[PDB]
Design a protein around this ligand. Structure first.
Ligand SMILES: NCCN[C@H]1CC[C@H](CC2=N[C@H]3Cc4cccc(C(=O)O)c4O[B@@-]3(O)O2)CC1
Ligand SMILES: [Cl-]
Ligand SMILES: [Cl-]
Ligand SMILES: [Cl-]
Ligand code: NA
Ligand SMILES: [Zn+2]
Ligand SMILES: [Zn+2]
Length: 358
């Protein structure tokens, strides 16, 4: 890598790892469109297995960017429209509170207060129907954004129904395979388990536990190389030869709602570039990111703006991930760690690196 990249990465990430007690970390810096890889520490402490470019990390809610792009691809195929009612895809959802809730609302957390988590008691198809049939909205649809797995998770499950594929098969066939993300998994196969890092929480080695709609909301695992390729693909969608996927990437970066200086895409979140770094850093704290806030609709949605900071945080019990990129500058970063450490620390480090390189 160029010396300027090596320098800023050492001076930013090694102290972050020191400050936050991160056991293992992988970073890709995309500079002039090309990834440069860095690793530190251990994927498995007790085995003394190092983080490598093949180590799988849990992406947590960075998975929602895959779900958003898969939904965009379905839009580009004509399989769904965001204005469609939820009940078009799930007719058994006969409870009246669902009248007026569209796929757009599910995808963008604006259905009116669907909860952050699907309850752990939901273990069967009938349990899930019962949960949504009995959910009572706090607000009218299209007025308040409340970040929620039960919202975008249901969006992803319904968006694949016209294809006839399971969510996993749709994601594999329509996103992972065309982009050559050959080490990205919803379910890690037995022969790849040797590369699956442990997450660390309060000194204990942990992996994400199964839950309803986990694949759609938080269940993807990937390597630093595949995640760099994901960033490259979202930086430069015209490089993608599959037109529906090129367009799905673009649609996931369209601006559907605004709250303050933040815009909601499909999975991705965006701000105008140049960005006020304090807004992305502070806005990433869960006290804010998880709070309900009023949204203003953007109709028609703004087509993807290349002068944007586009990003997403992710967490599981044992992992913390962050992706950010700036299409206009051909500049991005992926930070994968096997500890869930505070979001503002992630965003600050990402800002420091990308700001030094623009
Ligand atoms: N399709 C809904 C028909 N109206 C019904 C109107 C009463 C409402 C009770 C309620 N629950 C909260 C969430 C909510 C949802 C939709 C509309 C509103 C509204 O105030 O208009 C709304 O406001 B709330 O404070 O009022 C139940 C629905
Ligand atoms: Cl130094
Ligand atoms: Cl998979
Ligand atoms: Cl977890
Ligand atoms: Na699952
Ligand atoms: Zn140093
Ligand atoms: Zn050190």
């Amino acid at each position: 890598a160029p010396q300027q990249i090596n320098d800023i990465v050492h001076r930013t990430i090694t102290p972050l790892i020191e400050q936050q007690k991160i056991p293992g970390m992988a970073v890709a810096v995309i500079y002039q469109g090309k990834p440069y890889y860095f690793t530190w520490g251990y994927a498995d402490i007790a085995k003394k297995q190092p983080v490598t470019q093949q180590t799988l990390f849990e992406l947590g809610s960075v998975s929602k960017t895959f779900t958003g792009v898969l939904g965009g691809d379905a839009i580009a195929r004509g399989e769904i429209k965001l204005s469609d009612p939820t009940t078009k895809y799930w007719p058994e959802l006969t409870a009246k509170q669902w009248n007026g809730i569209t796929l757009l609302h599910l995808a963008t957390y604006t259905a009116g207060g669907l909860p952050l988590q699907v309850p752990d008691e939901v273990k069967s198809s009938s349990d899930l129907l019962r949960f949504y049939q009995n959910w009572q909205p706090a607000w009218a649809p299209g007025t308040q954004r409340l970040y929620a797995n039960s919202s975008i998770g249901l969006f992803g499950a319904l968006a694949v129904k016209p294809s006839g594929l399971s969510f996993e098969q749709a994601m594999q066939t329509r996103v992972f395979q065309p982009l050559k993300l050959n080490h990205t998994w919803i379910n890690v196969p037995p022969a790849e388990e040797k590369n699956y890092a442990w997450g660390y929480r309060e000194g204990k080695a942990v992996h994400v536990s199964p839950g309803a709609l986990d694949a759609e909301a938080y269940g993807v695992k990937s390597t630093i190389e595949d995640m760099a390729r994901w960033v490259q693909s979202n930086l430069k969608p015209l490089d993608i030869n599959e037109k529906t996927l090129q367009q799905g990437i673009q649609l996931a970066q369209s601006r559907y709602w605004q709250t303050g200086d933040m815009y909601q895409g499909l999975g991705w979140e965006m701000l105008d570039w140049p960005v006020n770094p304090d807004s992305i850093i502070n806005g990433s704290d869960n006290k804010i990111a998880l709070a309900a806030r009023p949204v203003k609709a953007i109709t028609p949605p703004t087509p993807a703006v290349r002068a944007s900071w586009v990003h997403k945080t992710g967490a599981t019990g044992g992992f913390g991930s962050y992706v950010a990129f700036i299409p206009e500058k051909e500049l991005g970063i992926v930070m994968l760690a096997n500890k869930n450490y505070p979001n503002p620390a992630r965003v600050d480090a990402a800002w420091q690196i990308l700001n030094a390189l623009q």
